[PDB]
Symmetry: C3
Subunit: 605 residues, 3 copies
Amino acid sequence: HHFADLVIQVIDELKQFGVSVKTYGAKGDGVTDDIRAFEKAIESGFPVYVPYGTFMVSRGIKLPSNTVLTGAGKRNAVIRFMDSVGRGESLMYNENVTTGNENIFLSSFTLDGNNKRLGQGISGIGGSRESNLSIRACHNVYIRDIEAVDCTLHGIDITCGGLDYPYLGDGTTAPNPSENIWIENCEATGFGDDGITTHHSQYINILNCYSHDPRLTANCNGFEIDDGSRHVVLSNNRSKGCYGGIEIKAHGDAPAAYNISINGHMSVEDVRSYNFRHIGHHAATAPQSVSAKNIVASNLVSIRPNNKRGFQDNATPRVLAVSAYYGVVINGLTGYTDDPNLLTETVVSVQFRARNCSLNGVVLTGFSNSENGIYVIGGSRGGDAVNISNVTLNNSGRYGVSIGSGIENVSITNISGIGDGINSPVALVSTINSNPEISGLSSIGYPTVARVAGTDYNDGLTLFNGAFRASTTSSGKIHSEGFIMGSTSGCEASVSKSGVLTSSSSKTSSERSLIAGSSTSEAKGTYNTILGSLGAVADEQFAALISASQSRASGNHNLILSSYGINTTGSYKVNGGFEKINWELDSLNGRIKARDTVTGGNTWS
Amino acid sequence: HHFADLVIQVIDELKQFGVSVKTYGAKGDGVTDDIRAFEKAIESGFPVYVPYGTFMVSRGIKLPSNTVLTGAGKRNAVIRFMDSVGRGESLMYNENVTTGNENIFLSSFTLDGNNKRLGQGISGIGGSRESNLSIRACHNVYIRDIEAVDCTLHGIDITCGGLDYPYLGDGTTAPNPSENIWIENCEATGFGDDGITTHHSQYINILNCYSHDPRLTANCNGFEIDDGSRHVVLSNNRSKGCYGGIEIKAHGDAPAAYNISINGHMSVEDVRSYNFRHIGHHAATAPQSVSAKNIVASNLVSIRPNNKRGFQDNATPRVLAVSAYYGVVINGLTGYTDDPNLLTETVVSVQFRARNCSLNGVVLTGFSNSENGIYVIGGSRGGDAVNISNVTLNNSGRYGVSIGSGIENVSITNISGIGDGINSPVALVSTINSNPEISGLSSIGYPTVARVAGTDYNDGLTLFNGAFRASTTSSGKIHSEGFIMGSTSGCEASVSKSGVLTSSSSKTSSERSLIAGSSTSEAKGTYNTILGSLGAVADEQFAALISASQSRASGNHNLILSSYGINTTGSYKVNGGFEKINWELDSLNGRIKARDTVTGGNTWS
Amino acid sequence: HHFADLVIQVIDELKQFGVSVKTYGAKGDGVTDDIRAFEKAIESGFPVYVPYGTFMVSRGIKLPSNTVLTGAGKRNAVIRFMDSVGRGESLMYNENVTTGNENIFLSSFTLDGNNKRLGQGISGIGGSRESNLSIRACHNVYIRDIEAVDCTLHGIDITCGGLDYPYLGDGTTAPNPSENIWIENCEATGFGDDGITTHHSQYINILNCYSHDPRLTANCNGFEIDDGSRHVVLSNNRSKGCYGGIEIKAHGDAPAAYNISINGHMSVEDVRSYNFRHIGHHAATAPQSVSAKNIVASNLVSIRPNNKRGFQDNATPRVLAVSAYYGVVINGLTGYTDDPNLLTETVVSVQFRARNCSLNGVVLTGFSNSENGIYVIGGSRGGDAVNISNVTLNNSGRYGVSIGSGIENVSITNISGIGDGINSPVALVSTINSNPEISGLSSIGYPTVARVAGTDYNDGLTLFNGAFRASTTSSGKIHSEGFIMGSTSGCEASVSKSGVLTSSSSKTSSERSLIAGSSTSEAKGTYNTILGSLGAVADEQFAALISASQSRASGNHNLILSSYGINTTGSYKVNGGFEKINWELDSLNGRIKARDTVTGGNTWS
Ligand SMILES: [Ca+2]
Ligand SMILES: [Ca+2]
Ligand SMILES: [Ca+2]
Ligand SMILES: [Mg+2]
Ligand SMILES: [Mg+2]
Ligand SMILES: [Mg+2]
């Protein structure tokens, strides 16, 4: 066969793809050990091509800097560990494990870790060892159209320098991150830990990948943005049959992933479709995470979340679970199930030190045997807020939106629900705290619409907090237990239980008071009333004026009526006058007094 | 040419791409029938490669399970029906039409259905027959970089088992769905029905595809998520010159697509850019769709929607049309036109049993001859809501945001509009119902800003519904026609037309009543007034107290003033006193009474 | 070597990829001029393939219509200008520079512009000349997996016909646009102007590209959507180390880009991550841009914005800067920094004639030495609005959300902030205007929560504008300085400072008035009070009625108490009666009158 060899030599020299591994002796026959051909091709300095075949390998494939490795495609070019391979190596990884490599471009092949060779139930022997593809401390890595199957640890792992993962504590940054990574159109399945994962690395885009069906039932996630990750975008990926669809977290002795964006995701039959947390920073008596911050997640799809496989000791399913994190913004979330018995606790939870979270544009459908649709619990932390808006629930949650203890600042707006198909529905909206801000509730089939600290509202509700002002373009100070309405400039209601209506330049510093229909008037005692008056002053307890001009009521329980230009000081007296006091009804002593006459037998014509 | 043949044999055995169809006798010369070479290559068990050429085929290409078929690229590897092919077959489809196949990976070629061969104006002969690519009942199918041209039926169709589409009625699930499908970077054009479409299948991602210019003018859509579809993501696709850009629907005797996500789309010169509907479930006298639920659509672009081509009997253009569906969430929509005469009815409609829909972050520009910007019509359904927020209109709609009949629950917030360039503008916002919730309206060039059930508001408007409470951290019950403001704990306003202001522990169950500036006071008759009082009770019709302490007014039209410690029961009497009644003004009989003296000739010094 | 030549001839005729440039004499040896082989291959009418090599070229590669040009991959197939090339040509461009070409498909190679050959600090000699890839006036162009390095002008430029850019003025459309362009998985770096840019062209998708590190420090942007662009989607791109991450703009003598969608982006260490502007249309005394309209941008990430490189004469960094544009909708924005000294002016600005902008779902973290988090300045324009909602700030901005002059319509809702780590924090929210609409503020570590036109609110605030109505399902007209609450149908409060509470069919047209607890009552003078009354009319200044039925008070300062069926007209009189006036307290003259008797010595038993 010397002629064929000569023809092949001519083809090899053409280098149509770069250099083929077969040029260096690779058989790709599913039997022969091709590791030396891969090593020789890779060290040559040429782009390396992997044609059709199953290329067996007796040890891991080490990648130097400036590597181009391209195959004929998934399930065409297949790279696979031999049955005889021992423990400790990922199938493919960059050669400099501690300080990393640069410019590595991998495309279009299957990595088959042959985990089967070890028997069933086995995961990685320690740290980041034994993934199908491990990238450690590398800059500029493009991973495209790679299928990762039968993986011992992870399918694809991006991590910092070192074989072990570092545990340096919260608020740290591990040395030698990977940086500028792109993972696109990859698939990971049959893995022991996670499908696609990042650790201690930054500037990463994960796009259009599919991670599904772990071998094991521990914390086995489709996409795991783990310890030390930051500045990562995930978009248009799918996860199926995992514990977490996308998990964003850290372990207790590590910094949480931060500044992570989910630009669309579809989670199919995961346990907790979207699961954001920081272990060790959940308890009320634990310190807040200093690292768990900034997640923006949009256009999230969750389908039939369940725990049929028994992941994580039968952890309860979730469409979304947020804990520990500050600053989580969720927009456009649809959760859907056709089986009410799969998820029966809480569809969406925001708990365990999660703070400053916002949910908007949520549709939850079919969770007709779950206790809660959305359930929020806080810690009474200063500067905290939870915002929930534009939510619709279709037979999802005995309590549709439930706010528990420790929440002082909550906004709940435009919530609607259908409860007719729910097993024993209770309330569309429930709060423990007495002062939620609420508007725009609509329901059918819930026996109670809103239950606010035990009080039911079934006919519509609008609740606002703090100093209130309406139909008034400017004013001075308004107390948080005060208001000004329908007024023009210059009004104030500066103490607890004080208010101004329909007035101009009128001020009250009177605890328990009302000024209405008045101008240039002032209340400054307590229990003061000023109505339809001009230049009126009430400056003693229970003093009041009605239809009075340029008058001052300074007596205890002293009321002035229908008067101009008088100042009164009497106790328990009603007075009237015009430039001088002209009559008195004396409640204290039972005297009636006129300046002029008192007469009976009168007529009014 | 025996030498060339030997060289070729050596090349074939190298299998650089897998196996070439030319190895099995394919000519790819645009004339010779290459079907047998395709069949032999495909049955061989190797990945199949299609090099440069136009590969003619006298019958459809049947795909078995575990097929890899890769070409040299669009407009490089071209697969085409011969002129002589008859009717009934799609150009490429999976072999097991009834129960399906698995693991099919198609990349990088053109499918030319040669519809031209049949003469003009022709579509598929029946059901799912005669698309360029038909996938029926398959699991795990990746379709990438395929260009579908001159298609008889659809470009790319994903469907359940069977050549016909099943019509099993609303609320059903057809047997043998396709599942786990990825369609990426594909193009469809010159089709008879739809470019890219799904039926009775689930877990599908359609990404970065371009569907444009149908041959026909029926219901010919760019992307059609049709009968029985569910759990589909579309992202970053473009449609051009179709009827619907993305249509999400079902026919009347089928279940509507449900739980569909649009993560960005661009629609160019379609008729109805985004068109969501369920035929047969639109009429007021028809049953609600049980299947039309859950659409989350974001970052939607609509450009110059028009019906120049006369699709669907000159159906009127739309940026967005929603009907039948429950739970549609739209966020980030820009509609733009440079020709006011293309769309003259309604830019965005939410009508025909659509319910529980939300629109947020909308910009509509240039629709200066359309009657309505956004037009919503409801059905007076329980638990319904329509939420419209953060909308800006630039010369778009004589009525900017219009709410028609059957809508009881509507929130309209932060709407702004410029109407100076509009042909005869009427109102930025109009509602038929008397109780919309409205705030944050801003306009120029509209003669009326808000028209609420016939009443105009041109100077700003804030409307809220239900029980109202402001500047009060806790309270007991508030009636839906009641309020509490500026108060501390323990207050109630529990009946129609009852209210508490600036008070503590004060309760009214009095229809037509007001308590203000008071403590521990109670109104329980009707027409009751309590002002600036402590421990005051008004418990008869028209009874009242002002500046009173520890007193009870129990008479008909009985008013107490400036008093301590009295209980009165007289009809049409004003009373005052201190531990005992001390004076009376008797309106009924015209008597004035003092306990002590009545005198004239008084002075106040 | 005649045998090798014969073998090669056989391989060439197989056309496995199309036609190789090596078939036409290309060496790809990094030295030999291969331009003639490229020209001959390209003119042949076959798809052209570029295998492994560095292919040197002594002049630009001209592309005709219907070109397919595919390489072996980035850093595999490399196309490069020779050192000796002069000035004036882009490395690759379509042949018909003035009226354009169609159907051009470019994939999988590096373009190396060899800008180095000119010495350092050099950019393009004029207009659109000397980019790595220039597309002028073309329809249907797909650019995929192209790496553009060492570029003289831009990496990839899409423009209209002509070598120069046209400057036709605002509101124009340049002839011969490019149309239907797709740029995907491309990289641009080491460019003189912009990485990837569009001019005077439409229907463009830019997806998953990476633009970084310009050579120069002028207006050198990652992605520049420039002069004349429209209908462009950018999604899942990354920019790093540029001036603008994504710039959307125009120069002064050109139309601004319009109707642009950003469906997710990550900006790393740019100066102004997102920078939208129209030069020449920013000044208060300049005309508004007629073209700068419609930007919808979502899921935006900004990381460590800074100006360490000194771009644009040390322009100050921004997460987001909006100017000139109408109708900008931002949803889901996270800005993050770990270095407080990089950005010290304003994190997010909306200024310089930007109008009708909305921000929602914003998290800003780490900007602890910046003066402002969000800073908005307007122009007092009619129909303008700025909407800011669901914002959380983590040690970002001495003023968290600041509203400056010229803003009449602002909505600020659900803002929370932590200020404890800020260098001298001032206020979470500050406004210059007296009438912002505000609710849902929460903070810790800011000395003031809200400062509204100089007045501080630290204990919560709810402010609404315009006519106000609550707990009332229908009403007649309400003045913008009026209100109706807790009422049933038929009420009106039609003038400044008029209000109705807890009433039915009661109307006030009385300036400075209040009706409460009443039915069928009417106030129509001024300074009118009607309380707990039925069929009561107050129609003179300071007239009032309390606990009155079927009575009319028509006197100046005339009050009726505890009465039925009387009409009074006296000045400064309190009256009561039953079908006739029965008593009077005359404040004017100091007379007390009874119809019947006046007596002392009374008891009430
Ligand atoms: Ca894990
Ligand atoms: Ca159709
Ligand atoms: Ca530039
Ligand atoms: Mg991990
Ligand atoms: Mg159909
Ligand atoms: Mg430019």
